[PDB]
Write a structure and sequence with these properties.
Distance between the termini: 36 Å
Helix content: under 10%
Entry title: Solution structure of 7SK stem-loop 1 with HIV-1 Tat Subtype G Arginine Rich Motif
Number of strands: 0
Strand content: under 5%
Number of helices: 0
Structural class: little secondary structure
Assembly: dimeric
Oligomer: monomer
PDB class: transcription
Name: Tat Subtype G Arginine Rich Motif
Keywords: transcription
Radius of gyration: 12 Å
RNA sequence: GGGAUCUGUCACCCCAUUGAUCGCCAGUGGCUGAUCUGGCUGGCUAGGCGGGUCCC
């Protein structure tokens, strides 16, 4: 029906770790 | 071999596409599926692997 996430269109951000 | 730190690599969450590009649909809303940037002053005693350093 509806996704749990509010938007969930961008993620991944830890290249520098 | 273990622990800590850094880097690289592999995933997740939130916000911005009235930030840019591609694809589908449509008169402008939705979809991250890919890449980049900003917020790590955000969550790594939240995870795995490799290398360097230090310690044992």
């Amino acid at each position: 029906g509806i996704s749990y996430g509010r938007k969930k269109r961008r993620h991944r951000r830890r290249a520098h770790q």
